[PDB]
């Protein structure tokens with residue numbers, strides 16, 4: 462792809478994080494802690510899942526960023542509306558304000574309703590995410606496989622400002638402790 466020139470510097474918003482997440486000093490990495498991280502509760506925190514938002518809000522234009530997922534067994538990545546539900550159980554779908562893909566149990570899927578199987582021959586170590594606000598497009602790229610296309614959501618109805626979205630996943634297995642990292646431009 463040729464989207465690299467729309468690169469934006471994303472940082473994580475601590476205030477939105479699930480209370481078990483540990484965000485690095487530079488706000489560019491996040492991982493699952495083994496306990497509550499001793500923060501107060503607030504209405505912005507995702508309560509049920511190990512999720513966090515980027516600080517940046519997008520309402521126009523073209524945006525691109527990259528995320529490192531090396532050695533993880535489970536994660537979700539994409540964008541979401543600023544006004545998505547934070548508390549309780551919910552599914553990741555465009556109806557609920559999410560445009561995402563995930564890894565789970567050795568398969569990759571797009572967060573449509575119902576979910577869509579992805580066809581990935583080279584497991585990615587870094588994911589590129591492209592958003593075209595005006596066109597209503599969110600696309601995902603396999604940086605490990607020369608930028609090959611993973612998935613395109615088109616005809617998106619964003620219906621609000623967008624924020625970068627992250628889920629580091631649970632670590633019930635002991636094999637999913639590795640962080641999500643925002644990669645340098």
Ligand SMILES: CS(=O)(=O)NCC1CCNCC1
Nearest residue numbers: 481493494495630631632633
């Ligand atoms: C390290 S772990 O992924 O196995 N923790 C699960 C907790 C389940 C109860 N709520 C917070 C998280």
